[PDB]
Paper text:
We tested the role of water molecules in t1A recognition by designing a mutation in Ago2 that disrupts the water network inside the t1-binding site. Ala-481, which resides in the back of the t1-binding pocket and is within van der Waals contact distance of water B, was mutated to threonine. Our rational was that the A481T mutation would alter the hydrogen-bonding landscape of the t1-binding pocket and thereby perturb placement of the associated water molecules. We first assessed the effects of the A481T mutation on Ago2 by determining the crystal structure of the mutant protein bound to a short target RNA bearing a t1A nucleotide. The overall structure of A481T Ago2 is nearly identical to the wild type protein, and the structure of the t1-binding pocket is almost completely unaffected by the A481T mutation. The Thr-481 side chain is in the same orientation as that of Ala-481, with the Cγ methyl pointed towards the protein interior and the Oγ alcohol extending into the t1-binding site. Although the structure of the A481T Ago2 is nearly identical to wild type, t1A recognition is severely impaired. Only residual electron density was observed for the t1A nucleotide in the target RNA omit map. Importantly, the Oγ hydroxyl of Thr-481 is 4.2 Å from the position of the t1A N6 amine in the wild-type structure, strongly indicating that the mutation affects t1A recognition indirectly. We conclude that binding specificity in the t1-pocket is achieved by Ago2-directed solvent interactions with the t1 adenosine.
Over two thousand unique human miRNA sequences have been reported and more than half of all protein-coding human genes are predicted to contain a conserved miRNA recognition site. miRNAs function as guides for Argonaute proteins, which use the sequence information encoded in each miRNA to identify complementary sties in mRNAs targeted for repression. Argonautes then recruit additional silencing factors that mediate translational repression and degradation of the targeted mRNAs. Careful comparison of miRNA seed-matched sites in the 3′ untranslated regions (UTRs) of human, mouse, rat, dog, and chicken genomes also revealed that an adenosine (A) nucleotide opposite miRNA nucleotide-1 is a conserved feature of many vertebrate miRNA target sites. These t1A nucleotides confer enhanced repression of miRNA targets beyond pairing to the seed region alone. In this study we provide evidence that human Ago2 contains a t1-nucleotide binding pocket that specifically recognizes adenine nucleobases through water-mediated contacts.
Author numbering: 22 to 88, 90 to 120, 127 to 269, 276 to 296, 306 to 821, 836 to 859
Amino acid sequence: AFKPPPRPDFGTSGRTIKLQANFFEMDIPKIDIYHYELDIKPEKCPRRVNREIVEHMVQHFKTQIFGRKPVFDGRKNLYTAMPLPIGRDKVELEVTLPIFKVSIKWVSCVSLQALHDALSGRLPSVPFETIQALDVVMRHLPSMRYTPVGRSFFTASEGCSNPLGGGREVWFGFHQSVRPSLWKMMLNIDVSATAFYKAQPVIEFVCEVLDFKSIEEQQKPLTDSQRVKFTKEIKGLKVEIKRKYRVCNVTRRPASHQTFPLCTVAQYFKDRHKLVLRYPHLPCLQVGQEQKHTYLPLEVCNIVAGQRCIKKLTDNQTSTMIRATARSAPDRQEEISKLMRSADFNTDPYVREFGIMVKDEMTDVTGRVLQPPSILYGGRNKAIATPVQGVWDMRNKQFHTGIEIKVWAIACFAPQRQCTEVHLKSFTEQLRKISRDTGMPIQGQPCFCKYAQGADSVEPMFRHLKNTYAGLQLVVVILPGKTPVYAEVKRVGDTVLGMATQCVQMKNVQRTTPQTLSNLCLKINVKLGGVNNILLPQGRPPVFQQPVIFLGADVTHPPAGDGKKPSIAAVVGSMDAHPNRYCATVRVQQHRQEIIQDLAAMVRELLIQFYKSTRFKPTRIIFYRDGVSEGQFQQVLHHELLAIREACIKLEKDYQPGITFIVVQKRHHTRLFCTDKNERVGKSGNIPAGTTVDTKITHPTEFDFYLCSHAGIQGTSRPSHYHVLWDDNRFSSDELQILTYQLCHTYVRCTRSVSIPAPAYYAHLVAFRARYHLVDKEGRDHQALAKAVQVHQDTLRTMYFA
RNA sequence: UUCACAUUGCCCAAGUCUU
RNA sequence: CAAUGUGA
Ligand SMILES: [Mg+2]
Ligand SMILES: [Mg+2]
Ligand SMILES: [Mg+2]
């Protein structure tokens, strides 16, 4: 239950396509490099400060120790191309910097020869410690030149300024990572951008925050309304006077009246520093320890450069950010290439110390474009849809199994002035028309239609409906826009009363269109238990010859900066042989834990419901797990694979179905581009839907592939990466690749191939719904949150999450 | 809250050292 | 899913 399976074979399906990847081939020398442990007292220092210490320590002790150019990981690991005068002997060094003790112990040799063998068929697995060393080599210089953020590097772009307002601006940067592959070692490079605080005087920072055209408007002290807004923006930020300080608070009193025991601030700077403040009417920054009385005037302070903006951007700052960084696929391709030529890695003195060479051109890789499956619809017509470039339509087609809607109601929470009875009548006309074409006929008018206001009217209205109207199938809820009513409608519908609801924005009622209404019917039919369509049965892979269940799993974590909100784990399982219908389980779990804690219980529920639905027991389980990074593969696989087994074992026997465990990663830094201009699709110029890459850039020994299953509308498509961590079923590359691709076509909310398999997509929708059930509510704590996300008995077997 | 795609927010990573 | 864009 541990080591992943090797690649069984290579795919042969689909026509070939010429691609370029943002991977850059690396030539590594076959020489031993020397690894040294370090220790710096004190070691509470920031990572950047540790690099400084070693920086000077290396030059201060050039003679008799560092005669050459070593690299340092910022904590405790130092690498040299040639050995030092050491042995395993410690060396206590005393270093000085505008008071540190640095100890240096040898630890081991790192053979780059053993890496060539691992990348070959010679060695079974890739030595992590070797990949780690190469990474520190490539990161040494940029970790000091630029501002490190994750695996990326950022800097103020020379000659340009991308202001966001509020004292913030866009910095451009790039991601950098070292990866083994079937071919060589690869440097993965991709461009990015993020928000940074402008390194400007605090005075200018105030003006942008408070929206002043200039200071001196006015020369009166700030209103508490202004002083609070400004305090919220600058608190926690670092400022400089030679001397750096983090702002912990903004004083209430102006510098002229704000005092401290040794006297007003404006007077202290008059006497001690001989400075007369130009704006004494303004408050002071309290800096350092919150429990001391260190106050700086705004005039003598700058925001120190290189501080990323962690807080959420405003709506306008966001809009600005999007415009500044949006790029078609070809444009992004050129931005990466331009960056790399300018990057000039090969002139890096440290890269060259270790004799590493980096190719300045994108690796060429051959992909295949898989054929889409045929989609089977219903009605008498029984039409077959044929996806083209990842898209099809429902025109002249009807659901495989459409629901007849006899009893339904409308509840309009939009103001009657805004959303008229006429609007509602007209909306009902068009929806019924579209529902007829669509195969899910709404046979009559709503049995109930009443205006209402506020979250309070929801539950009493829904209780009345459930009691009054027998066989009620659906409540359509009209909402004015963004409102807390939505979360309430879903609380009551999903968890309290177990009633199907379909919300619609007022603006989409006032002005409808055939495409919107059609998409709206896709959701409604599913919610009411229908089947929109199915994969052409005879076109499916062999796996469907025996009972199989398809599982999707995801964990969604709280936003950045949050500290106490729970993580939400969601698992969904197919309930028919199509596969189309899914049931869902959801749990709250520990803050920022990726491992699905209660998975065994969740899978047991799904297996039971599968048997109740199909009267089969799955002979195979295909589990698609979203969002686990490589550094978590072993941990996650260990717990979750055994959890699936546990579920089976506890159910019966000797019930041991084959498990295929697949990790899906949509958010990585691999990008694929069309080599030939006439292969690019649409305005965004992306690779076509179905493009598959299982060679060259993929893993040297293990079973992984990229599949870009969707049409790229805008920007640069993210090709989803799939990694097989376990496979009892012994899939070939072809079967697995085709299976995954076909499951991307079974997503009920649209007639498009989506970017990840339906089961994994549904798991996201389930987690996000739970998050809505928990709005403003996030042992005794756990049970409260657990109950909030527990859906009504009548909702359990439904696709309420659609 | 019609829907997908795209940027960010999510595990790993990153970050968290006299007035 | 939220903010912001591109689209159907
Ligand atoms: Mg996740
Ligand atoms: Mg960590
Ligand atoms: Mg959106």
